[PDB]
Amino acid sequence: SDLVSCCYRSLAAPDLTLRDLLDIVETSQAHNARAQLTGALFYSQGVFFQWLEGRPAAVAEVMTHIQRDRRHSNVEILAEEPIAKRRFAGWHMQLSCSEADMRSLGLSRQIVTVGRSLVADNTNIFSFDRIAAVRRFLSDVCAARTLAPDTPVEADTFALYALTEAQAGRSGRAKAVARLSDLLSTDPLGRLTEVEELLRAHAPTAADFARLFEACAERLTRALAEDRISRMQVTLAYSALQMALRRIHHLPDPQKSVGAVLVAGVPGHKPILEAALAAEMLRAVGWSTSVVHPESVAALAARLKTSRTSTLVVAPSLLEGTEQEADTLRFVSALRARTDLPGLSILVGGRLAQLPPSKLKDSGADAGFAHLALLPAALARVA
Ligand SMILES: Cc1cc2nc3c(=O)[nH]c(=O)nc-3n(C[C@H](O)[C@H](O)[C@H](O)COP(=O)(O)O)c2cc1C
């Protein structure tokens, strides 16, 4: 064989255009054609996924050029594996995007469309699941169109691929959450290294961290309710998770950002972890993010009229939910009163996000996110 594959994820420049994508595609088609390289490029919501395959040397040279490119950043290698045969034969470099992005760019082949519509807000689908699903989908589309070019492929076909991948990971993840919840319930600080290793194994990205945390959080809320653990135990666990998070994920603020956002807790609530996660998730898709733990409504009012950052995410406290709801209500309402900013947007999580959007209108908050991992998606909608 002697064929190799390389795949990475990167953050497209915030000012990226169709002309750029097309230039990349033409350059890449030409060069890959000469150098005997194949693969696919997937663009969705400011993010690139790419797969490249060929002889080792070719892949290495082209990666040398790509890494230094200035139309994207945070290139993270995801795989460098030997393959038995090409997954994208005939595709020197084929472009593809999500259905939503197809709408946003005004496109309608030859660009392979991926319908994420049905699975995008499914919290059981982890990051690597989406990546592998995209890979398999595109490889298959490549085969198909190699056989029957004028035979169109349904975008929403991808959904099944994604769901299938997630389902493959489900059991193992359940084990992980169980083991984890046990650790957090016993001595999370005495066994922090184990917590970290688990998290590191099962949560490659920050959103994954968020999924695991939601699961553990309901487990522990149940445990605390049934008086099986103490409040002190929950505080310990919370600390342990903050430490583990910071050790593992700690993205710098993106220099070229899609926008700026303020993440704040409600005064008295200490959503330290949830705010950190929110910041990590938003940073990972290209948002400039600031975390604030204000102690008065007025403080935040000042910071907002100073920043002129028209977007505010109120991070929920998923472990102090005795009175998160009415507190958040009062807080957002108060904030809206002391504020004179027609462009201001507010997003809310927790139990408040579980209410029907009618209540959301009534709330003065603009939109909700019933699960942490849904936050990026919820933000893009308002933008
Ligand atoms: C997301 C992305 C994917 C790219 N993929 C390829 C590729 O598969 N093959 C290629 O030759 N260039 C690719 N490029 C372009 C290279 O980064 C770079 O423009 C080119 O290889 C060097 O230009 P040259 O034609 O003067 O050698 C890609 C660029 C970006 C931003």
Q: Which domains does the chain have, with CATH numbers?
A: 1-114 (3.30.70.100), 115-250 (1.10.1240.10), 251-383 (3.40.50.280)
Tell me the pairing of strands 259-264 and 72-83.
unpaired
Taking the alpha carbons of 368, 370, 374, 375 in that order, is the dihedral positive or negative? positive
- Indicate the burial class of 339 (C-beta count within 10 angstroms; 0-12, 13-18, 19 or more): middle
Residues 259, 311 contacting (CB under 8 angstroms): yes
Total residue count of the chain as it appears in this document: 383
d(CA 332, CA 360): 11
Q: Within 6 Å (CB) of ligand 1, which residues are found?
A: 24, 27-28, 31-32, 39, 41, 48, 50, 52, 62, 65-66, 69, 71-72, 93
Instruction: Determine the distance separating the centroid of ligand 1 and the alpha carbon of 113, expressed in angstroms.
Output: 21
- Indicate the burial class of 11 (C-beta count within 10 angstroms; 0-12, 13-18, 19 or more): buried
- Closest Cα to atom 25 of ligand 1: 27
Q: Sheet of 112-114: strands edge to edge?
A: 72-83, 3-12, 47-54, 38-44, 94-98, 112-114
Residues 369, 378 contacting (CB under 8 angstroms): yes
Instruction: Determine the distance separating the centroid of ligand 1 and the alpha carbon of 282, expressed in angstroms.
Output: 27
d(CA 215, CA 213): 5
Is 71 marked as a binding-site residue? yes
The backbone torsions φ and ψ at residue 50, rounded to the nearest 5 degrees and listed phi first, read -130, 145
Residues 341, 304 contacting (CB under 8 angstroms): yes
Angle, vertex CA 277, rays to CA 309 and CA 320, nearest 5: 100
By C-alpha distance, which of 90, 108, 27 is closest to 62?
27
Instruction: Show Cβ contacts of residue 357 under 8 Å, excluding neighbours closer than 6 positions.
Output: 367, 368
Please state the atom number of ligand 1 nearest to the C-alpha of residue 30. 11
